[PDB]
Amino acid sequence: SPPVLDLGALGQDFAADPYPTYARLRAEGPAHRVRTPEGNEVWLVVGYDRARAVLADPRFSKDWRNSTTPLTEAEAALNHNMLESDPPRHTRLRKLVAREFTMRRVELLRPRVQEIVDGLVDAMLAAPDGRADLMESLAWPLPITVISELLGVPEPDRAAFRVWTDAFVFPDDPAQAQTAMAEMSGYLSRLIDSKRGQDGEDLLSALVRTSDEDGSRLTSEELLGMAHILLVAGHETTVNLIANGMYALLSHPDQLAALRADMTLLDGAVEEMLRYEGPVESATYRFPVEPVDLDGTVIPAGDTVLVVLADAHRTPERFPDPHRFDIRRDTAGHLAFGHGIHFCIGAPLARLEARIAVRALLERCPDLALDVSPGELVWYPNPMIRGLKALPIRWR
Numbered sequence: 001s002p003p004v005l006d007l008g009a010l011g012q013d014f015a016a017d018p019y020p021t022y023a024r025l026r027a028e029g030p031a032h033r034v035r036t037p038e039g040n041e042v043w044l045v046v047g048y049d050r051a052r053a054v055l056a057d058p059r060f061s062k063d064w065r066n067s068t069t070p071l072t073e074a075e076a077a078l079n080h081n082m083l084e085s086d087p088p089r090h091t092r093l094r095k096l097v098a099r100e101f102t103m104r105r106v107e108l109l110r111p112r113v114q115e116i117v118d119g120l121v122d123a124m125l126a127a128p129d130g131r132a133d134l135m136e137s138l139a140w141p142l143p144i145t146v147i148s149e150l151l152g153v154p155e156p157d158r159a160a161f162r163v164w165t166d167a168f169v170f171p172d173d174p175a176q177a178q179t180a181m182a183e184m185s186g187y188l189s190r191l192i193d194s195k196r197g198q199d200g201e202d203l204l205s206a207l208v209r210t211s212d213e214d215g216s217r218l219t220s221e222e223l224l225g226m227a228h229i230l231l232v233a234g235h236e237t238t239v240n241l242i243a244n245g246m247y248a249l250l251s252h253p254d255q256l257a258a259l260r261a262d263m264t265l266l267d268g269a270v271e272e273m274l275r276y277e278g279p280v281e282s283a284t285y286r287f288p289v290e291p292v293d294l295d296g297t298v299i300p301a302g303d304t305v306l307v308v309l310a311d312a313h314r315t316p317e318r319f320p321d322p323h324r325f326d327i328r329r330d331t332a333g334h335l336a337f338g339h340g341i342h343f344c345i346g347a348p349l350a351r352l353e354a355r356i357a358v359r360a361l362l363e364r365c366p367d368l369a370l371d372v373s374p375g376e377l378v379w380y381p382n383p384m385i386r387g388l389k390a391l392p393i394r395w396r
């Protein structure tokens with residue numbers, strides 16, 4: 001029952017570089033009870049083959065009615081979304097927006113996305129001494145603008161979102177996380193209400209109309225659950241991809257020039273950014289419905305389980321030379337977007353924003369470099385999301 005390892009005792013060492021610790025675990029076995037820096041005791045499933053199994057395994061439920069851990073009031077407010085569901089609710093819910101996030105549909109957004117990215121890079125090259133934080137001026141503002149537009153979040157109300165979403169990455173403390181969720185959940189509900197009767201053409205309006213017309217298709221809870229899900233999962237992961245990506249790029253200068261000289265490598269590069277430093281370090285909560293034997297180790301019904309995608313991707317048997325960042329490696333079968341029914345619905349939009357951004361910095365900042373001695377970067381210690389506090393850069 002008790003943890004064999006406390007991760008928060010491992011300090012910034014672990015946050016900077018968690019891989020050898022996961023790697024240490026994988027040697028020993030596939031699953032390990034641990035305590036997270038914020039002190040919840042969870043299970044970690046490690047290693048590609050087993051990691052992949054667990055993601056698609058329906059013995060593992062994403063529905064909290066199956067978790068022995070009780071939800072707080074703020075959280076219960078928001079747990080009615082597809083990602084925290086099993087069939088059929090999951091089915092009814094995903095189907096409501098699937099059309100929306102296909103590759104083809106998204107391609108009709110390339111122009112606007114491009115327009116946004118031009119705006120921010122232009123602004124960014126105007127930093128007097130050729131220095132600034134990539135996170136602050138590109139990686140955060142791009143995804144939030146794009147997704148806000150898709151969903152009808154008015155510009156004045158966007159700033160608050162960096163603040164709130166931060167508050168449930170690493171919270172300073174569990175009290176600040178909770179406040180965020182209520183503050184946000186509160187704001188989303190006004191926003192949803194403000195849509196009623198306004199003939200918006202954005203997806204939130206559309207959902208409100210869908211919901212109001214027939215509350216058996218979408219309940220008022222699920223409506224809020226969706227707005228949230230599509231927003232957070234829209235902001236946070238994309239932001240960190242871009243920021244993890246550029247960083248992998250900037251810290252291996254050979255791979256940078258390679259893509260700089262040949263922009264056919266862009267998609268590959270973005271795939272290796274997801275393979276190598278993907279923003280989803282551990283997939284979201286999983287609750288075995290009955291006890292599950294993973295090679296001798298018996299995880300009990302209703303425990304919290306995390307699949308460590310970060311470790312999946314550093315498994316040498318599935319990825320030769322797992323520590324080398326190689327923009328041309330075969331990246332197929334990576335788990336960065338998950339695997340199975342819950343497979344990420346907005347991968348195409350993610351790839352799109354990232355591709356455009358990575359190209360824009362490379363074609364518009366010659367001589368771009370890390371501004372900062374790499375070991376002076378600071379990583380959030382949360383074991384779910386892989387993320388930088390800041391990412392200073394420079395140019396000629």
Ligand code: HEM
Nearest residue numbers: 082083233234237238241283284337338342344345346350
């Ligand atoms: C690089 C960016 C992204 C990464 C790495 C990523 C990764 C993931 C992963 C791993 C899952 C499944 C998690 C699990 O099984 O617990 C997932 C699901 C999901 N993602 Fe993303 N995602 C990204 C971008 C986005 C964006 C931009 C959106 C905005 C629409 C989005 C919306 C969702 C939703 C709604 C689900 C739940 C799908 C379902 O339960 O059927 N994601 N994503």
